[PDB]
Amino acid sequence: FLKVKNWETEVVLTDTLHLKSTLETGCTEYICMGSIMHPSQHARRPEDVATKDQLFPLAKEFIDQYYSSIKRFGSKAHMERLEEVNKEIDTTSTYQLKDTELIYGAKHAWRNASRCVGRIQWSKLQVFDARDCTTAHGMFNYICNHVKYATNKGNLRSAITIFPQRTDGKHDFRVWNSQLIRYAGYKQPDGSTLGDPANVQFTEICIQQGWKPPRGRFDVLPLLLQANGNDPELFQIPPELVLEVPIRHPKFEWFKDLGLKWYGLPAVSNMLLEIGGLEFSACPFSGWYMGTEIGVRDYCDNSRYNILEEVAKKMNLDMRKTSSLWKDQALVEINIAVLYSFQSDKVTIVDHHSATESFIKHMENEYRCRGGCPADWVWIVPPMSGSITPVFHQEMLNYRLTPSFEYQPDPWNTHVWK
Amino acid sequence: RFLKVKNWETEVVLTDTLHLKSTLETGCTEYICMGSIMHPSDVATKDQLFPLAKEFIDQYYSSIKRFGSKAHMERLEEVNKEIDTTSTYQLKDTELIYGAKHAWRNASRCVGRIQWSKLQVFDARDCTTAHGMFNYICNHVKYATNKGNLRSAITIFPQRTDGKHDFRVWNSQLIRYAGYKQPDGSTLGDPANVQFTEICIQQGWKPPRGRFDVLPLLLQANGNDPELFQIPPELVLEVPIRHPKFEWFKDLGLKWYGLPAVSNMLLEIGGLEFSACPFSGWYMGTEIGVRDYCDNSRYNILEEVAKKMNLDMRKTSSLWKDQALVEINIAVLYSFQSDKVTIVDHHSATESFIKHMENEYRCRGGCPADWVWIVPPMSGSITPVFHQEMLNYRLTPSFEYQPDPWNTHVWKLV
Ligand code: HEM
Ligand code: HEM
Ligand SMILES: C[C@H](O)[C@H](O)[C@H]1CNc2nc(N)[nH]c(=O)c2N1
Ligand SMILES: C[C@H](O)[C@H](O)[C@H]1CNc2nc(N)[nH]c(=O)c2N1
Ligand SMILES: Cc1cc(N)nc(CCCCN(C)C)c1
Ligand SMILES: Cc1cc(N)nc(CCCCN(C)C)c1
Ligand SMILES: [Zn+2]
C-alpha cells in the first residue's frame, strides 16, 4: 500500500488501486518525469493490427474487468462472451464491443483520466454510439447532434460520440480539429498574429483545403472530418449550434468594449479512446469549462491571445516593472469577468475554487470505494492561485489504468493524400 | 542515453545527460509517479562510506581539472586511511566549500539557484558547545543581513559520528515568529510554529505573547540537551508591511523578517552527514505574501484584507480570495523595496531560473528540477517555468530532510 497525506487537513488515504496499473508512467526510481507532457510511449498493443496473441489478452482483461464490475465473473454470459471475442478475432483480427461494454469503457476512461479535475461527474456521461458511421457527412451529422445535445441551451451536459474503431490503420476515422469549436488564427503580414495563435497551423490547413476565412479575431473554425481513411472534408458548424458568451466585467464598464467573447462548449476531439485493445481514434467528448481554462490560459498565455497587455492598460496599472504584479492583478480581473459573464448568461461554468473542492471530495470517494484515484498534481492544480485551493496541499499518486484516453499524432503528419 | 525536455512556450528543446550521474531514489517506480509526495520514503558503515567518499573525491578532482593526478590519488589514499582507522574522514576546506555550493546547485526544489556559485561558506567544524553555535549563528546572521543588502551564506557544524553526538539547530529557520494557541482555539502569532513555541516554553523561555515574537535559538551540540539563546534584536532586520495604494494596510500591523534561513536540513557530502548546517538567502515575495500570510494554516489574513477591500465574500466565484492574495503580495514587495531589503518577485525569479536552467544544460548537461516546487504558488501559468518541462533526479552533495530532533533525542537532565 501507499499513503497520500493532505497537509492542510492531515487526512491520510491509503492506495491499493495502483496495483492494477498496466502502463509505465515514464518515471524510474532514478528519474521522475511528472512534468513531461508525453512521458511514455508504452502502449498495450503494437503500432498496427495485432496478432491474436497480442489482442486477445487485452480483450480478455477488459471483458474480465467488465464482468467483475457487474458481479458476474465466470458466469455463463462471461464465458460465452470470451468465446465470442475469440471467434471474432479468429475471423476478423478484431472484435466488437457490446453497447453496455462500450458505455462502461467510456465512463471508466474518464474515471481513469488522472489529469482531469472534473471527474466527480464521471458516471454521468451520455454516450452516443456512432460506430455505424461510414462517411465524413455522417460524422458531421453525429457531431452536430452531439453539440446540440451537450449545449442544451446553456445547461451543459457531458457527452461523448464514438466513431468506428481503428482496423488496419489505413481506414482511420479522425476529427482533425483539436476541439470541435475553436477560433481561427491568422499569420499577419507584418509578423504578428490575429485571432488564436494556437490554431494558426490548423487554420492554414483549412484555408489550404478551400476554406474562405472571414479573417476576424473570433472566427469559428470549420470541421475537418476524416472517415474510413479517406481525405478529410470541410463542414461549417451551424452558428445557432455554437453558443458564445460576450465577456463583460461586473465593475469595469469599459471591459465590454474590448470586444471579447468565448464559446460555451469545451469539446476535445483529437484524443484516442482505448478499450480492451481497441483504439477509437475519433471520440469527441465534451463537458463544461473551469473558468481558468479560458481566462488564464486562452486569454493570457503569451503564445495565445495574450491580452494581459490591454486589460492592464485600461486598468491604469504600472507596467514598468514586474514587481508591481500588474500581470497578476489583470489576470484576476479577467477571470472575474469570465465567470460573471457565463453566470449572467446561464451558461454552465465552474470556478477553480469549487472545482478543486469537488475533486478532493471525489478523491475521498474513490479511495473509500475503489482503493485509489490516479491523479496528476501538475495538471490538477489550477494555473492561478494554486496554493489557496485545497488540491495544492493534497499529495497524489499518478498511475495509468485502462480503459483510458490517450494522445495520438496529428493526422496531417501521417495522412497520405489522394 | 539522452533525455529531452521541451518548453511549450518557446519550443526550446534541451538534452539531459547529467541524469546518468544520479544516485538515490526519487520515490517513483516505473508504474507510479510520486512527484507530489512531500518526502517519498543509524550511521554509515566502513564499507558503505568508502565508495561514497571516492565518488565525491572523484567529482571534486574532476571539477578542478585534476582527475587522475598525483594529488587526486594521494587524497583518495588519505581518505581511505582515515575511514580504515577512524570509521570516518575529514573534508579539506576546499572540499567543504565545493560540497556546500554543489548541494545548493543540486537542490531540485530551489528556484534561486542562479546564485549558487556565490555562497559564503562558514566552517564551524571546530565548534564544541551550544554557546559556540550561538556565536557562529550570530556572526552568520550579521554577515548575511548586511543592513538589508542580503548575502547568501551557510554555516557548517561538525558532522555526525555515531549518531549519539549530533549537532542540531532545533529551530526550522534561524528567525521565525512564535505561535500561541489560545484556550478559545484561536492562534496568536504564526500557527506554523505553535509546536516549536511549546518546546521553547517548556525549556524555560519566557514568551512575550505577541503576534511577532522572534523565537529563541534552541541549539544542540555534541548530542547534549539543547540550550536556549536570544538572538540580539539589533541583528534581526524586519520590514513593516504597507501598501502603495491602500493606506489602511499599515493599520493591519503586519511585519516580516528579512532573512530566510533554513536550519533543520541535513547536508550530505561524500557520505558525511552535516546535521546542523543553517543556510540563508533572500526571499521570493510569494513565500511571505502567498504562503506565510494566506495559507489557511498560517497567518490567514485573506479575510481581513478582503473585508477592508469591500470585496463580495458571499461566493467563491467573485474571486475575492484571488483579489486579496494579489494585493497582499504587492504590499510585501513594495515594503521590502521601500526599505531597501533584498527581495525578488516570482516573475523575476522564474525568468532567471529558466536562464539558469538553460545555462546548466549547456555547461553541465542538465539541471534537476522539481516542477511541483519550482512553479510559484500563485499565477503559475503566467510565469515561464509553468511551460517548461523538467527532469527530477537526486545528485549528491545534497540537502536532505531529517527527523525533527524532539522525536529522536534522548534527554539527560534531571
Ligand atoms: C464535466 C466537466 C469537466 C471539467 C470541469 C473538466 C476539467 C478539466 C481540466 C481543467 C483539464 C485540464 C486540461 C487543460 O487545462 O488543458 C482537464 C483534462 C482532461 N479531461 Fe476533464 N473536464 C470535464 C469533463 C471531462 C469529460 C466529460 C471527459 C471525458 C469523457 C474529460 C476528460 C479529460 C481528459 C482526458 C483530460 C486530459 C487532457 C490532456 O491530457 O490533454 N473531462 N479536464
Ligand atoms: C538566494 C536566494 C534564494 C531564493 C530566492 C530561494 C528560493 C527558494 C524557494 C522559493 C524555495 C521553495 C521553498 C518553499 O516554497 O517553501 C526554495 C527551496 C529550497 N532552497 Fe532556495 N532560495 C534561495 C537561496 C538558497 C540557498 C542559499 C540555499 C542553500 C545553500 C537554498 C536551498 C534550498 C533548498 C534545499 C530548498 C528545498 C527546501 C525543501 O525541500 O523544503 N536556497 N528556495
Ligand atoms: C502536497 C504538495 O506537494 C505540497 O503542498 C507542495 C506543493 N508545492 C510546493 N511548492 C513550494 N514552493 N513549496 C511548498 O511547500 C509546496 N508544497
Ligand atoms: C511543462 C508542463 O508540464 C506543462 O506546461 C503543463 C503544466 N500543467 C498543465 N496543467 C493543465 N491543466 N494544462 C496544461 O496544459 C498544463 N501544462
Ligand atoms: C471535456 C473537457 C472539459 C473541460 N472543461 N476541459 C477539457 C480539457 C481541454 C484541454 C485538453 N487538452 C487536449 C488540451 C475537456
Ligand atoms: C535559503 C532559502 C531562501 C529562500 N528564499 N527560501 C528558502 C526555502 C525555505 C523553505 C523551507 N521549506 C521546508 C518550507 C530557503
Ligand atoms: Zn515521477
Coordinates of C-alpha atoms in Angstrom, one line a residue, chain A residues 20 79 89 114 143 169 292 296 331 333 381 397 414 416:
Chain A
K20 CA -3.7 -2.7 -11.1
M79 CA -17.6 -17.3 -20.7
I89 CA -10.6 -12.2 -33.5
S114 CA -5.6 11.4 -14.0
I143 CA -21.1 15.9 -34.3
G169 CA -4.5 2.0 -39.5
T292 CA -9.4 29.5 -15.6
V296 CA -5.8 32.2 -17.6
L331 CA -5.2 38.1 -14.5
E333 CA -10.0 40.7 -13.2
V381 CA -3.7 22.3 -9.6
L397 CA -0.3 9.2 -6.8
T414 CA 0.8 10.9 -41.1
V416 CA -1.0 10.3 -47.3

